[PDB]
Amino acid sequence: TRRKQEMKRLKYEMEKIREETEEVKKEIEESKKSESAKNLILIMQLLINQIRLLALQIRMLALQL
Amino acid sequence: MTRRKQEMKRLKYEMEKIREETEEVKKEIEESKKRPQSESAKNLILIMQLLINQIRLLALQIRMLALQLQE
Amino acid sequence: HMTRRKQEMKRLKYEMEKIREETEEVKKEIEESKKRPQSESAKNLILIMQLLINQIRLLALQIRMLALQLQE
Amino acid sequence: QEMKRLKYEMEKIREETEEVKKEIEESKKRPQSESAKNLILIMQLLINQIRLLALQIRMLALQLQE
Amino acid sequence: TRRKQEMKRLKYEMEKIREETEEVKKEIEESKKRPQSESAKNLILIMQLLINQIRLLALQIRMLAL
Secondary structure (H helix, E strand, O other), X not given: OHHHHHHHHHXXXXXXXXXXXXXXXXXXXXXXXXXXXXXXXXXXXXXXHHHHHHHHHHHHHHHHO | OHHHHHHHHHHHHHHHHXXXXXXXXXXXHHHHHHOOOOHHHHHHHXXXXXXXXXXXXXXXXXXXXXXXXXX | OHHHHHHHHHHHHHHHHHHHHHHHHHHHHHHHHHHOOOOHHHHXXXXXXXXXXXXXXXXXXXXXXXXXXXXO | OHHHHHHHHHHHHXXXXXXXXXXXXXXXXXXXXXXXXXXXXXXXXXXXXXXXXXXXXXXXXXXXXX | OHXXXXXXXXXXXXXXXXXXXXXXXXXXXXXXXXXOOHHHHHHHHHHHHHHHHHHHHHHHHHHHHO
């Protein structure tokens, strides 16, 4: 019983993180109104993609649960 | 049986402690962003936001495995 | 259950296959940037990017594995 | 065979990251620019990640073992 | 059968990844051979952390395979 309740809450926080990640993307998007800035934003886009995969992973793990 | 669960409980605390330290830094980062910063410091803060978000995902992932090992 | 899990699994792998393609385009932009001449700092940025890309790939592999651990 | 290699390779990683952690603390003992401190934060966040991946590995080991 | 073709891709896929990180590692060592600003030294320490993270993921994959 406790496995399902803990699991449900876990997936919930994840979504909130993803949504918190989208606010950053908006700032990244809006912030794109020089080489350093461009290189940094790419890194930020790379980090965000990584966050995307981390979330998919948790979903894959949940499937097994 | 119990030893297997014990190590799983110890490792869970090592995460929880890490989650704490990370959440505190987030607060300090939030306090840095209100006080306007340099154009470079801004991007560095935004990157820190993402890395923090990854830490938290990774903490969720450790709770996931711990469930699966529970059963 | 069986058909919903599969689809949810399929969309996970599918949506994953898009993120990998996105990272590849950035890899080509950076490698053109890697060719052009840039300061020591910018070069190190490029290097840092290349590491990020490589460790995206390993997360992708991890998902592919989990999928197969689910499929089999 | 695989376990020891995995553990040995991991325990080895714990050392190479400690080599990085020492430099940070030595850095922090030296006077820095504001820009530096932001990087030191990033390296601290990065190390936190490494700490967590390491705990995941033990979790995975815990499972497969039994 | 198909899962076997996937392992073929996955084993190769990795070692291609392991070669590229080595390529970055080669640039870090040659980087360190020249005088470096305080910032770029912190950059290097960062990418060394990233390389470590790559090591850990590969182990997870290996352990997920076992």
